[PDB]
Amino acid sequence: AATREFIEMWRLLGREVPEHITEEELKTLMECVSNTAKKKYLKYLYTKEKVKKARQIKKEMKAAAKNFLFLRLWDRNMDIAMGWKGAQAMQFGQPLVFDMAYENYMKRKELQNTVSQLLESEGWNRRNVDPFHIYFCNLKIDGALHRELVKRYQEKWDKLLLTSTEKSHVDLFPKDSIIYLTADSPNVMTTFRHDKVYVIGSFVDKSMQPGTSLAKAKRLNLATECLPLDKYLQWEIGNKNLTLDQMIRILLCLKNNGNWQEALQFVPKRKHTGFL
Amino acid sequence: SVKGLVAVITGGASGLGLATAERLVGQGASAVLLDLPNSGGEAQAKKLGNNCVFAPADVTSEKDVQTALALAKGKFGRVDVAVNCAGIAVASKTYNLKKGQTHTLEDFQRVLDVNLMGTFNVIRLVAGEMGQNEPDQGGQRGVIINTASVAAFEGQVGQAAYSASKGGIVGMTLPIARDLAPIGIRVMTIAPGLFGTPLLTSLPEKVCNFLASQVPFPSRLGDPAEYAHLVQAIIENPFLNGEVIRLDGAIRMQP
Amino acid sequence: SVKGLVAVITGGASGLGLATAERLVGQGASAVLLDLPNSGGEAQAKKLGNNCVFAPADVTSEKDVQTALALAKGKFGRVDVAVNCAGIAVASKTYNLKKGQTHTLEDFQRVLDVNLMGTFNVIRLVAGEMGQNEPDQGGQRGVIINTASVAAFEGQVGQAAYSASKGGIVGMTLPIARDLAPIGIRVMTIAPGLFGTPLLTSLPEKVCNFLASQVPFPSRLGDPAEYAHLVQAIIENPFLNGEVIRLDGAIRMQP
Amino acid sequence: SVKGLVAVITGGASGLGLATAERLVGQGASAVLLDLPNSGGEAQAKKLGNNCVFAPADVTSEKDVQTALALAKGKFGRVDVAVNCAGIAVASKTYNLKKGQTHTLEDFQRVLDVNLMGTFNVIRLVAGEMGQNEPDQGGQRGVIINTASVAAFEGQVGQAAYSASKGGIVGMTLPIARDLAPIGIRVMTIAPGLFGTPLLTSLPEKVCNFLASQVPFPSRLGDPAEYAHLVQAIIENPFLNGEVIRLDGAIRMQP
Amino acid sequence: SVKGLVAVITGGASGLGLATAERLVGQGASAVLLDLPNSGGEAQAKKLGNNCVFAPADVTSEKDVQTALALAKGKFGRVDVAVNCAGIAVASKTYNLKKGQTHTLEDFQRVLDVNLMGTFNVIRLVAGEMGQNEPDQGGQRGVIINTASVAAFEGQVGQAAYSASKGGIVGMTLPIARDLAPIGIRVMTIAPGLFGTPLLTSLPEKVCNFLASQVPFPSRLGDPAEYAHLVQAIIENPFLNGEVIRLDGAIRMQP
Amino acid sequence: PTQPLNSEEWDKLKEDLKENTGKTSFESWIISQMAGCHSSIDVAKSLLAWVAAKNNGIVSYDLLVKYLYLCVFHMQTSEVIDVFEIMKARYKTLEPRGYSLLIRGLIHSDRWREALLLLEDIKKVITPSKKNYNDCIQGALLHQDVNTAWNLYQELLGHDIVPMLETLKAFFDFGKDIKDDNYSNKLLDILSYLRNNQLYPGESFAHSIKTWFESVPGKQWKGQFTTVRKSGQCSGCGKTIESIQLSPEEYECLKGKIMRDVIDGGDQYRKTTPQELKRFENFIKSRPPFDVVIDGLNVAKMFPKVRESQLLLNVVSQLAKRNLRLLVLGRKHMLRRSSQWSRDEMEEVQKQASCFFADDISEDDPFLLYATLHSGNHCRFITRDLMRDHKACLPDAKTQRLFFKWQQGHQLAIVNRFPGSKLTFQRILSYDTVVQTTGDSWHIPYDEDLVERCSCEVPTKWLCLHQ
RNA sequence: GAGGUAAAAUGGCUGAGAAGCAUUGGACUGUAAAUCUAAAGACAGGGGUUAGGCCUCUUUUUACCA
Ligand SMILES: NC(=O)c1ccc[n+]([C@@H]2O[C@H](COP(=O)([O-])OP(=O)(O)OC[C@H]3O[C@@H](n4cnc5c(N)ncnc54)[C@H](O)[C@@H]3O)[C@@H](O)[C@H]2O)c1
Ligand SMILES: NC(=O)c1ccc[n+]([C@@H]2O[C@H](COP(=O)([O-])OP(=O)(O)OC[C@H]3O[C@@H](n4cnc5c(N)ncnc54)[C@H](O)[C@@H]3O)[C@@H](O)[C@H]2O)c1
Ligand SMILES: NC(=O)c1ccc[n+]([C@@H]2O[C@H](COP(=O)([O-])OP(=O)(O)OC[C@H]3O[C@@H](n4cnc5c(N)ncnc54)[C@H](O)[C@@H]3O)[C@@H](O)[C@H]2O)c1
Ligand SMILES: NC(=O)c1ccc[n+]([C@@H]2O[C@H](COP(=O)([O-])OP(=O)(O)OC[C@H]3O[C@@H](n4cnc5c(N)ncnc54)[C@H](O)[C@@H]3O)[C@@H](O)[C@H]2O)c1
Ligand SMILES: [Mg+2]
Ligand SMILES: [Zn+2]
């Protein structure tokens, strides 16, 4: 009512606000504590609207604009082959853990972004020649991460060739085999060991309190390692923390007998100047 | 008809053997559940009725199988059918270059002894008691049905030993049929696909669901009652001899 | 059970097809004998009962099979089972060096057209018919059972064309089983050996007796009633699909 | 050794036939490329030198094959080897319930007529030609090598007719070997998997990469040069007869 | 080519293994006979020359095979091919009613061990040995070629144990190929028919002459040099993997 | 343009300047520049008339808001009223800049009670800025309505907003007219707020305070602009300014809120392991209080041209000669011999001092803070670190200001810039610069208008007021 | 294995100051599925702020002080 008129008067003045707003997101706006939070949420809605209408316009543009051996059924065949390899990985694949205990240290924005990165990481893993066997540890059934994952995967969640457990990776695997990957680790990863379970924190860190993964690894005595980014790259900008999908791609490249340069090809080019 | 016949089902306390025993005892036949003492054979035998008797035995052992056959003869006086549904499975790759792991020879030998040597032990010891039967009209004294697997034709990764044992059963099916044809015993083999039994408990549940979804039709795990139906059909068909039947729903396994 | 099922038996006037029709009708099903005008199927259809009708048709032609299937739909309203038992036999050597004689291309063409092409014609039109049936509790719409020969595997001198056609049937059994899996139709094959029908009996009687003696066990020619028994077994087992069953008594042919 | 022999390859102007002709002419054998007039057989024959000749012909036509064999006699005075590689492929689903679409009988018939019937026509006529050869030390007059596919064993959705043709060749491989054993001619069959020929190399890059990844090892499409290698190995081994060899790299075709 | 390759031939002192060793050493390769101390492989290794060495081993025992592979590595530094030709044969009927005789479990166990368990033991140790090789262009590390008679497919009266062992080898050929595909090892199997070796000539001579007359073409028994030819062909073909080749001259055995 | 234009003039100007206009429309761009350069309202009115004529009497909201800005900047109340009527007629609710400009313009007119309604209308979705409250308070004070002014001030403080010093200056400037005890006590409340929140009046605000105090009846205040002598005594009277040391209650709560927050912030594994906490705590309670608490790694790393142990030994010996009881925090890796570190010099350190070595992965600074605080007020610590991060991880702002005061009082920083020179520490003030009372006397720092400051250093001038 | 100061920060990757290439769930696709459909779009994270601008505190990165 009044709010939906303030937002229109801001739209008229050239402010970054959504053209159309709905009731649930109006409630979300009113749940923002301060003026700056309201401005940020409104800008987010505005850019969502821009991108949605741009892609819809592109949809309209696209709409306006013998002896064979195989029927063209290629996508289904690829999916089924990936499923066979995923089952084989479940049986004889190397474990790769994703710790889901950071749900307390994340607000909604970074929780949703974490879910997106998890989806992309799993997608990259499925396509590989020798997939890992993935674990989602400390994933609480009633948690927010579980809800978002069962909302993004939908009815594929129960058909996913990975282990989802509400227990800890210190209970599923031997304590001495676990290596916990974190950028704050004093120790560096010289080589990829094939007998070690690697634990990646499903955590987009946008808090100003650093070293949470290291605290988790210390509370339960575990080995820690970090990628040798500084040794192999001329870092210029950006934090050393990499997205989960980049981490899994690097680990997959290393797993399939890849050198460190080929593996680190997945580090963003904007963050480093070149290779050494 | 199976009415009045006596059947010796090895590994009859669980899964496919138990289903076959249930169907046969429901059709009026008598059943001997030859199985390990550790299994729940006693409870199943009591449940089935007075026509079912449990024999604690190890198919790998000559003395145990001889004692079980003696019990069957004493109780019912003869043996008419022998079902070999006793076996074990293992999941180990021949060699793993990344992990530097090699298949254990004891694992291979254990699987080969239980699956392949126990079947032959039962076959050879049961042919003796079948030979004592007077030929029926047509000259048939008994029927032997062995359980192979589809791993004998397309085995999976980490299924080398199991595939070897099942391929051995498939290979010896016909030579034994020719051996026993002079005296009138039919030797048959069944190669089931994926069936819902305790044997599949080792696999992860999601892997089992994927494999069930990969069966062309019906897209589900097999039902032991269906294996029992095929067993009865083989028992009642005089002209089925020395052949392997794939009860797998048209599934062809992939690596 | 087969009670209430509607079956279309190709070549059902005589031989294995007639035996299958007799058994299915006796068990409570309904039968359509799809056969040639001069086969004499009208008398057999009268003999079986009111539940058996005779459809004149030549499997080699679309129109005849379509008319027969329309007749079946009109008479009974559903098609649940199909049994391909029509075929012909030809004996001729590829080349006689002594006699300077070469196999005829017309013999190969006609044997291939009747055994292999007619089977596909019937399969595809009957699959179109079954696609209209409501799925059963198991999702099944029908069953197709082709007839092959052990010549598909161990053929004999003079059986180049017969072996070719039967091997084609055996080869195409699985592709079709995968094609029709989404619909819910099960496709199976039976490969009999030396059954007592006019096709075999047309050979020299001495050869008939010798072949009867060659069978390991039972040491006799097959009984079409046993073929019908196996056909019913395939019908009643949900989990048999895309497989070839050898109903031959453990016989393997010599050159 | 193949030095001095005369080979007749059907479909010799492209793919596997061209590779076989290339290898055999390189090793010193004379070659006749029996192929359609519209293909590029003349250019290939010119490239291969004076030891290679091109014969326009249709394997489905008896007169064309007879003229090609007469040309081979005129040019080289003898026929020692025959390689049947000429065939076509057709992909078409047996029945599509959602689309209400049925397989066309003309597609099935043309696939059969080219592959299976042309193979048999060439086999019989070339056997008649080889019969005129004086026996070699060891009693051999010639060798015939047919091409098949793994579709004959496991066929993918839409490969009913192609699977039927390949399975027919596989089925008739042994009967013809037994027929021609008195004459002294060996008959063998090769079952390629996925090969880098114009059938496959024309497909998109993504699907080519997928198919290459499907082969267990080597994880690539086959090279016709090593099909020619296998053909030469068959020619050089007197004791390979009436057998099917799978040159597929351990790939089992997915549903 | 095979020049510069290191081949470990089990049972290389006698028959097929010895022929393979001779051919490979004559083609420029190196050979490590792996046989029992009493076989007399020292003399044959001396006869071949300085590219052949002898290793006293019992394939049934892990330590002996490990020591033999260590000897091969020390002598030549590398293992490229492994030809598994060791085996024994037993002729005993499963059960004899007139004679009241039963197959002994000891004979079955001994044959099974030596043929199947020893073959698996050698395969699993040589796979670890070959894992050390640097892949060549194409990614190939090694080749393993097992021997498994045609008794795997059709076994004669009294070959129950031999048929079981060879069927086991044939059954596990493909699982092991899929297991070792990532490593880049090709696993192939040869299935010879009747060959002229001590094993064959042991049994009554006129029976052997009859059996030779039963081979369609060439009638004469197989020649081990031709087994060696086929082994070399398998070594030189990159795309032969996970297949069983019958080298028997088209003979199909009878009861 | 500098003079009102005709419609044809506007059109030809549009044709010429559409080249420069760029992305936005001509009229919006031209009025934007006019607002930027403060054009007279007649020119803008002419532009709006031309736009409306072209657009059938409809002038966009943005143009009308920028015109409102122009006619509020030039203190033209009549056009502000007219624009207010136009806004009310055409729109049912306005935008916060529109509301802000309307409030800023309406405080002057007679219709100044409507600006409060506009403020309430803003309050619906957003918290009004500090300037909206400032303008409403000034409008209420100009019309002799003090109850509403104090209500608005109290609402401002209720929304946790820091009032702009202009508003407090306004209260003090208007206070002269009134002679009431309640108003004087409220002004003293404003002074106490200044004291609590560490805010310093501006020079004009200082003069306003001085005048208000001097105008009080009965008690003849005397005001002076002075400075504080190094010994913590202002020149005006010689009285001693308040001490920089913390009050005992404040010191206790700061010990508590540092232990429970900076060290074991509910985890006890992030900074250090529980074993190290227990060990350090036992070690501290074993030794009697200390006089200095050195940070070994900070004082060793100062000069890169000297070995770390060498610098540590030099500093420790120079502090030892003074008879001070030392405490040398550090890390375990300091003990193990290296090129940088040598056992001889570390043994000299452990005979001259009393050391404590933590794990190489633990954080030293919190241990430094707690050792110093546990010792007592007399204790001091040697470090160049400013400890911004540890101050950040404190619950609220009051605790952070307490920490900053204590840090000023007790931190010693090495100003020395070469190893050879003698050890000298940056000066530590003995007194705190803050608005303060001594019964009657009032001492109030302030900032000089024509200077610049930093949050590091604190005002030098003072205002001394004696009853 | 510690600090001070100043510039920088795209959480799938490139950009522009727009946009392309990707990602997730569905579609048994007749060979441009080179598709069609839904899902996800916060330029480091918090507070403020101008007529238009941009400031401020934390975290991180880099380069200097050296
Ligand atoms: N999915 C399947 O179940 C499946 C698929 C293919 C083949 N098979 C074969 O079917 C047979 C039975 O399958 P199942 O599902 O019923 O198995 P199961 O694991 O349920 O059978 C358990 C039974 O086996 C008996 N047993 C095992 N080893 C024995 C031994 N050495 N001596 C005596 N008894 C022994 C146990 O006592 C117990 O009664 C096995 O040969 C199996 O390999 C089964
Ligand atoms: N010994 C055996 O009986 C034996 C062995 C192997 C395979 N088979 C196969 O079994 C099937 C049944 O043969 P059978 O034993 O009944 O022999 P049969 O000779 O009695 O079969 C004759 C039947 O085929 C029908 N028929 C032939 N050509 C036809 C056509 N073009 N259209 C329609 N009907 C046609 C006739 O009308 C008649 O009903 C055949 O496919 C046969 O090849 C039989
Ligand atoms: N990937 C493969 O190449 C593959 C896989 C399995 C089976 N096969 C079979 O291998 C054979 C050859 O494969 P290819 O890739 O070389 O094929 P291709 O398509 O490259 O062969 C083309 C040649 O076939 C000849 N040809 C076709 N039909 C003919 C006819 N009726 N009469 C005469 N000549 C005729 C043409 O004239 C031409 O020379 C075919 O039977 C094919 O189905 C090949
Ligand atoms: N006619 C044939 O020769 C024929 C036919 C089919 C299959 N085969 C198979 O071919 C292989 C070899 O045939 P062959 O004619 O050379 O047989 P053979 O009997 O001549 O082979 C004897 C060799 O086997 C070795 N050997 C046996 N057991 C051994 C063990 N446990 N450890 C090590 N060495 C052992 C002996 O030392 C000797 O070198 C066997 O697997 C056989 O079954 C042969
Ligand atoms: Mg610090
Ligand atoms: Zn004073």
XYZ file of N, CA and C in Angstrom, chain C residues 29-86:
174
model
N -8.243 -69.260 -22.170
C -7.975 -68.092 -22.990
C -8.798 -68.145 -24.276
N -8.597 -67.149 -25.135
C -9.231 -67.080 -26.443
C -8.149 -66.979 -27.506
N -8.376 -67.624 -28.648
C -7.338 -67.796 -29.653
C -7.808 -67.337 -31.024
N -6.887 -66.731 -31.766
C -7.074 -66.412 -33.174
C -5.977 -67.131 -33.944
N -6.374 -67.995 -34.872
C -5.437 -68.760 -35.688
C -5.217 -67.984 -36.976
N -4.125 -67.229 -37.028
C -3.782 -66.421 -38.192
C -2.965 -67.288 -39.138
N -3.565 -67.697 -40.253
C -2.903 -68.675 -41.110
C -3.372 -68.505 -42.548
N -2.820 -69.341 -43.427
C -3.084 -69.249 -44.849
C -4.500 -69.718 -45.172
N -5.053 -69.274 -46.304
C -6.404 -69.729 -46.674
C -6.521 -71.236 -46.827
N -5.489 -71.894 -47.351
C -5.539 -73.319 -47.651
C -4.931 -74.179 -46.552
N -4.584 -73.586 -45.410
C -3.962 -74.348 -44.334
C -4.917 -75.345 -43.695
N -6.223 -75.172 -43.878
C -7.180 -76.012 -43.189
C -7.448 -75.583 -41.767
N -7.255 -74.299 -41.458
C -7.445 -73.817 -40.103
C -8.889 -73.665 -39.682
N -9.818 -73.606 -40.637
C -11.226 -73.471 -40.278
C -11.707 -74.680 -39.485
N -11.342 -75.885 -39.929
C -11.759 -77.089 -39.221
C -11.182 -77.125 -37.813
N -9.904 -76.775 -37.667
C -9.287 -76.769 -36.345
C -9.941 -75.735 -35.438
N -10.240 -74.552 -35.978
C -10.892 -73.519 -35.184
C -12.267 -73.973 -34.719
N -13.019 -74.647 -35.593
C -14.285 -75.230 -35.160
C -14.058 -76.260 -34.063
N -13.028 -77.090 -34.222
C -12.792 -78.180 -33.282
C -12.477 -77.654 -31.888
N -11.677 -76.587 -31.799
C -11.235 -76.111 -30.490
C -12.401 -75.613 -29.643
N -13.296 -74.830 -30.222
C -14.459 -74.356 -29.503
C -14.916 -73.011 -30.029
N -15.826 -72.396 -29.270
C -16.343 -71.080 -29.630
C -15.337 -69.970 -29.371
N -14.352 -70.207 -28.510
C -13.371 -69.194 -28.149
C -12.210 -69.118 -29.128
N -12.185 -69.968 -30.148
C -11.136 -69.960 -31.154
C -11.724 -69.567 -32.499
N -11.137 -68.553 -33.124
C -11.560 -68.097 -34.441
C -10.374 -68.214 -35.384
N -10.663 -68.377 -36.673
C -9.639 -68.541 -37.696
C -9.613 -67.312 -38.592
N -8.436 -66.707 -38.726
C -8.242 -65.552 -39.590
C -7.335 -65.938 -40.750
N -7.837 -65.990 -41.984
C -6.937 -66.203 -43.124
C -6.019 -65.003 -43.293
N -4.731 -65.272 -43.473
C -3.771 -64.192 -43.619
C -2.425 -64.770 -44.012
N -1.678 -63.995 -44.789
C -0.317 -64.329 -45.182
C 0.594 -63.302 -44.524
N 1.436 -63.760 -43.595
C 2.260 -62.848 -42.809
C 3.120 -61.955 -43.689
N 3.354 -62.347 -44.941
C 4.232 -61.592 -45.825
C 3.640 -60.253 -46.247
N 2.360 -60.004 -45.977
C 1.663 -58.831 -46.485
C 1.065 -58.017 -45.346
N 1.151 -56.691 -45.474
C 0.551 -55.798 -44.486
C -0.959 -55.978 -44.424
N -1.608 -56.040 -45.588
C -3.066 -56.028 -45.629
C -3.653 -57.245 -44.928
N -3.083 -58.425 -45.172
C -3.627 -59.642 -44.582
C -3.512 -59.615 -43.065
N -2.341 -59.233 -42.551
C -2.152 -59.196 -41.105
C -3.053 -58.140 -40.483
N -3.220 -57.002 -41.160
C -4.097 -55.962 -40.636
C -5.542 -56.440 -40.573
N -6.009 -57.130 -41.616
C -7.368 -57.663 -41.589
C -7.529 -58.695 -40.482
N -6.531 -59.564 -40.303
C -6.611 -60.564 -39.244
C -6.663 -59.909 -37.868
N -5.842 -58.881 -37.649
C -5.839 -58.206 -36.356
C -7.144 -57.459 -36.121
N -7.702 -56.850 -37.170
C -9.004 -56.207 -37.037
C -10.078 -57.226 -36.682
N -10.027 -58.404 -37.306
C -10.973 -59.461 -36.973
C -10.834 -59.876 -35.514
N -9.596 -60.012 -35.035
C -9.382 -60.384 -33.639
C -9.937 -59.321 -32.697
N -9.659 -58.048 -32.990
C -10.182 -56.964 -32.164
C -11.703 -56.973 -32.142
N -12.328 -57.148 -33.307
C -13.779 -57.174 -33.357
C -14.369 -58.341 -32.590
N -13.739 -59.513 -32.691
C -14.307 -60.703 -32.069
C -14.136 -60.682 -30.555
N -12.977 -60.233 -30.062
C -12.680 -60.309 -28.638
C -12.420 -58.967 -27.970
N -12.043 -57.933 -28.720
C -11.890 -56.605 -28.169
C -10.524 -56.292 -27.601
N -9.669 -57.294 -27.412
C -8.324 -57.067 -26.907
C -7.386 -58.096 -27.515
N -6.108 -57.730 -27.582
C -5.030 -58.653 -27.911
C -4.030 -58.594 -26.768
N -3.780 -59.739 -26.136
C -2.882 -59.817 -24.994
C -1.599 -60.574 -25.281
N -1.639 -61.575 -26.158
C -0.484 -62.415 -26.441
C -0.383 -62.631 -27.943
N 0.849 -62.744 -28.425
C 1.122 -63.083 -29.813
C 2.162 -64.188 -29.845
N 1.940 -65.189 -30.691
C 2.837 -66.332 -30.800
C 3.164 -66.523 -32.274
N 4.386 -66.168 -32.664
C 4.842 -66.299 -34.046
C 5.378 -67.712 -34.237
N 4.585 -68.554 -34.903
C 4.944 -69.941 -35.174
C 4.892 -70.288 -36.656
N 4.688 -69.313 -37.535
C 4.663 -69.583 -38.965
C 6.074 -69.605 -39.531
